[PDB]
Each structure stands twice: as C-alpha cells, then as structure tokens.
Amino acid sequence: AVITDWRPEDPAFWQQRGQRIASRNLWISVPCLLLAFCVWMLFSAVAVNLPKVGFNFTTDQLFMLTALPSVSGALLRVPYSFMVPIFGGRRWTAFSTGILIIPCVWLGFAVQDTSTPYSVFIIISLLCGFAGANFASSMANISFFFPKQKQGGALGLNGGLGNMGVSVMQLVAPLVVSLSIFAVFGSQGVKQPDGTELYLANASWIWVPFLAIFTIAAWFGMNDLATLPVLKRGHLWIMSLLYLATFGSFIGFSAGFAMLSKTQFPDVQILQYAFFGPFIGALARSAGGALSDRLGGTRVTLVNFILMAIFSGLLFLTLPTDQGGSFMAFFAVFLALFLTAGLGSGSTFQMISVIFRKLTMDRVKAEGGSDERAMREAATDTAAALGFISAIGAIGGFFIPKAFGSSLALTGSPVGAMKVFLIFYIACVVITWAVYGRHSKK
Ligand code: NI
C-alpha cells in the first residue's frame, strides 16, 4: 500500500521493513529503467536498417533520427523529476514505462510501410525521447527509498544497470530482426541481397511484452512514499559541460556509431559488434564512480579527459580517405572512446555531488547558518543541480550524431565533426584543471 511511515535512517526501521520494501522497489525500477534506455536509443539500430527495407532517406536524415530523441529526452528530464513527488514512484513508474509501448508499437508498423513520410519518423523519434526522461524520475524515486549512506550504492546500481539498456537493445534488436517471430501479429519480412529475410518490425515490437510485464509489476510491486536558484550558480554551468562531454559523449556515440561505421566502412555489418561499445561504457560508469570514491572525482575526471582527447585524435588516423583502412583500428579506438566516455560519466557525476555539496556547505556557513541547515540545504541544492546537469548532458546525444550528419553532408567526411569533438575535449581538460586548482585540492 501507500507508505505513510517511512523512516529509512532509523536502523531498526530499516531492518524491520524498510530494507525489504526498498529492495523490492529498486529491483523493479532497474528493469523498468533498463527498458527505457532500450526504447530511447531504438533508432541507433533501426536507422541502419531503414534503407534495407526500402526507405530512401539521406544520411543526414538517418543521423537526425538517432539524434532527436535526446532533444525531447533532455527537455523532459526536469519535468519528469518533478512528477515522482506529485504522483508517487509506483504510479509514475508504471505510467512512464507503459506509454513507451506507443512508440514501440507504432515504429513496428511504420517500418513496414515505405510510404510512411519522414515526418512520421520524426514524431516517433521524439516519442522515443520520452524514454530518455525516465532516468530523472527513476533516480529521484530510488533516492527516497534508501538512507543517505546507501543511496550511493543504490543510485549507482539503478543507473548503472539502467544504462546497460542501450547495449542490450543494440544486441537483441539486430538478432530478433532476422527471426520470423511476431508473424501472428503481422510481421512481414523483406528479402535481402544475401537471400536472408529482414523483419525490422521485431526491433521495436520485441520490447512491448517486456514493457507490459514490468508496467504490471510496477503497479503491483512498487510503493508510494508520503514523505530553483541553482541556475544562477556559475559552477552549475561549468559542471554541466563536463557531464555533457562524458555522458553526452556516451549517449551520442551510442546513437551514431553504427550509422557512422556504415558511412566509413559500408562492407562491415556493424550491428553484430556495435553493442559492445555502450556495453563497456555502461560498465565503466560504475568503475568511474568507484575510482572517484577512492581517489577523488576531479583527479579521475581530469586524467579521463586527457584520454578522451588522445583517442579523439587517434580516431583521425583510422579513417579511410574515400579507400582505405582500417576498421579494426577504427573500432578499437571507438571502444576506447566509449570506455572513457562511460568512465568520465561516473567520475564527473561523483565529482559534481562532492564539489557542489561542499561549496554549498561553505556558503551557508559563511552566511552564519547552523550545521543542521547547512547539511540539508546542501542536500537540496545537489539534488537540484544533478537533475539539471543530467538534463543538459543529455543534449550531447543530439549533438554528436547531428554533427556527423552535417559534417558528412557538406564535406563527405566526419573529420569536421571529430575536430569539433577534439577541441571540446581539450577545453574540458583545461576546465577540469581549473576546478582542481581552486575548488578541489583534496
Ligand atoms: Ni569556481
């Protein structure tokens, strides 16, 4: 039922009923969020296979389809974070998971109809973006179920396994598309040059039964708990760039890596390999957080950004001047980018929760605030900041595939976009060096 008496900080309460309830909510939240990341990056897999079905959209148009869900995603993250305390975690989780069936079902029918206008795919693309907003509400919700000591571990597991949703989708979708399942629901195949049949509808339809099962499980298994001037702070905008360069890079490369590989090395079936990128990136986010706890987020973030810049530079030497070579180098460097982008995602996030909380602490104390008020306002501000940072960092998921699409459109080469990425990474190691010299000497 709806919980009125929730005392997670009380050890006796936690041992008695708190831990068991919070364990159940967390472990229904994780699959629900994982599925959100599946639906969010759907077009990273589908847009690769649209020409194979009969669509004649330009390369720039295809990239745009992978880019757009990060727009609505970013925009809706701040509103989504406000929804949980209003409607409760259980109800909003079920609602925000369930509505993802609409673009999943729609896209399945849409890909079988080569008369479907590009405009309709734009709508579906944006609709998939709703899935990208679930992160803000899912994470906000889980924080209330855990004591401040265990939130770090609880939020890390929910977000970590959540981000795994990209890789599992980029693994499963290419596999079920070759399968003749869902025929009873009208799954029609398209004959490919190699003789095999392509069932593109399966790529989105495969999630519908799982979206439904955990929509049901959310309504029956989760609970509701009865229990900003941050924009002005210059540090908020400073940190947002860093999370933009890391999480934005992870989610941006996830959106457009397959599409790019198709434009650089068209022979390689990238879809049987691409998932590994977002896979290690999602694992490195957890690694990045763990390292940051032991050594300090800033130190981890700084070294990571130097690494992002190096591999950003090395990526130029892998590209073909269309002929020729080398894919194996190209993929290796991109794995390194995924890993560092993920690593930096976790490190930056830990860093923001530390730096912003510390400066908030020192501020209210400087105003003559009590220790009690200092701690709680530091909690409000950091929770408010991270939510806003997370929304801004999401826009990188648009920028990178949009930059690849534009660079190729006017030059025929992605190096223009990559050069922009390199400068951004070099700017970031400068930024991160600055905060290491003023705000973080620990
Ligand atoms: Ni400063």
Q: From ligand 1's centre to the CA of 73, what distance in Å? A: 29
Asked if 203 and 230 sit in the same domain, the reply is no
Q: From ligand 1's centre to the CA of 350, what distance in Å? A: 17
Asked if 256 and 307 sit in the same domain, the reply is yes
Annotated binding-site members for nitrate: 77, 163, 243, 390
For residue 226, the tally of other CB atoms under 10 A from its CB is: 9
Q: From ligand 1's centre to the CA of 437, what distance in Å? A: 9
Q: Which amino acid is at 202?
A: N
Asked if 197 and 259 sit in the same domain, the reply is no
Nearest CA to 341 among 436, 249, 432, 255?
A: 249
Counting the structural domains of the chain, the total is 2
Return the bridge partners of 275, or none. none
Asked if 181 and 259 sit in the same domain, the reply is no
Element spanning 142, H or E:
helix 134-144
**Residue 110 exposed, middle or buried by CB count within 10 Å (0-12, 13-18, 19+):** buried
Asked if 215 and 233 sit in the same domain, the reply is no
Helix 234-264 with 69-87: angle, nearest 10 deg: 130
Residues 6+ apart with CB under 8 A from 133: 72, 73, 75, 76, 77, 79, 80, 96
Nearest CA to 335 among 288, 298, 282?
A: 282
Q: From ligand 1's centre to the CA of 150, what distance in Å? A: 29
Asked if 349 and 365 sit in the same domain, the reply is yes
For residue 77, the tally of other CB atoms under 10 A from its CB is: 24
Asked if 324 and 391 sit in the same domain, the reply is yes
Domain residues for the domain of 177 are 1-225
Method: X-ray
Residues 6+ apart with CB under 8 A from 229: none
Residues 6+ apart with CB under 8 A from 155: 139, 142, 143, 146
> Which string of DSSP letters, residue by residue, matches 304-319?
HHHHHHHHHHHGGGGS
Domain termination site, one of 197, 225, 253: 225
Q: From ligand 1's centre to the CA of 400, what distance in Å? A: 28
Element spanning 197, H or E:
strand 197-198
Q: From ligand 1's centre to the CA of 235, what distance in Å? A: 6
Q: From ligand 1's centre to the CA of 425, what distance in Å? A: 19
Asked if 283 and 239 sit in the same domain, the reply is yes
Asked if 237 and 361 sit in the same domain, the reply is yes
Q: From ligand 1's centre to the CA of 151, what distance in Å? A: 27
Q: From ligand 1's centre to the CA of 368, what distance in Å? A: 21
For residue 304, the tally of other CB atoms under 10 A from its CB is: 31
Asked if 283 and 170 sit in the same domain, the reply is no
Asked if 302 and 327 sit in the same domain, the reply is yes
Annotated binding-site members for nitrite: 77, 243
How far is it, in rounded angstroms, from Cα 72 to Cα 321?
35
Q: Between vectors from CA 156 to CA 151 and to CA 158, what angle results, nearest 5°?
A: 95
Q: From ligand 1's centre to the CA of 403, what distance in Å? A: 30
Q: From ligand 1's centre to the CA of 433, what distance in Å? A: 11
Domain termination site, one of 176, 193, 225: 225
Annotated binding-site members: 77, 163, 243, 390
How far is it, in rounded angstroms, from Cα 219 to Cα 402?
38
Domain termination site, one of 175, 203, 225: 225
Q: From ligand 1's centre to the CA of 434, what distance in Å? A: 8
Helix 297-314 with 276-295: angle, nearest 10 deg: 150
Q: From ligand 1's centre to the CA of 439, what distance in Å? A: 6
Q: From ligand 1's centre to the CA of 146, what distance in Å? A: 31
Per the CB < 8 A criterion, the answer to whether 203 and 127 are in contact is: no
How far is it, in rounded angstroms, from Cα 385 to Cα 243?
12
Resolution of the experimental model in angstroms, please? 2.3
CATH assignment at residue 16: 1.20.1250.20
Chain centroid, CA 65 distance in Å? 16
Asked if 166 and 235 sit in the same domain, the reply is no
